[PDB]
Amino acid sequence: VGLSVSRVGSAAQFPGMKQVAGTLKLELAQYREVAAFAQFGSDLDAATQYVLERGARLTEMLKQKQFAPIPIERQTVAVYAATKGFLDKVRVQDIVAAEEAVISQVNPAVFKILKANGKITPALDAHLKAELRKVKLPGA
């Protein structure tokens, strides 16, 4: 994600993604910087460890299995529920279950709204904050 740039598509994309995607870019850039700064674990600052936890969480969120297309409405929710909290309860491991878990356990009515509207309205932002806390997450 450091060398991969596409500057015609940014500010030309799906804006409901683009709300959380800039924050996602900053968290991935911070994870790149602190992973370069800690190629080996000897110094613990207890707030940079929040970055090193969040980045290894988001790296596990973004990676996927082969031949598996994911539509943009099932992608905005899965990056929304990871750029924010709602997923720090697992260490790093069962996010491979947690992404399909949060895809399954949300109302599929919100997917039509987030697809047709184009962006995360506050009328849908409060629903997105509301649904994301009742999740039966398999990670504990």
């Binding site: 500010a11 800039g22 506050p122 409060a126 904050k129 509301a130």
Partner: protein, 104 residues
Amino acid sequence: ILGMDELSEEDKLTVARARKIQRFLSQPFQVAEVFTGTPGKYVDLADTISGFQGVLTGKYDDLPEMAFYMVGDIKEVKEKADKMAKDIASRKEADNKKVSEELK
């Protein structure tokens, strides 16, 4: 090969000054704001000479490296050092007093 630990203290001073003036040549552009959201900054020549003379002599040695990254000039460096310090503690407290109750 060895790291910044092996170097002497004057060489750590040179390396710290060099990293500050190496990040300080960066600026966010007014044409790069179409893919970044950062507003572009025009830097006057007197402000270039002020900021770079200051980081060469050592008027701003207390500031970290990231205070000089993507900044206009030496006023905005300390303005970003104010912002950089502030978020290191105030990071929390958004649980209640939100619009995200159901009835409004």
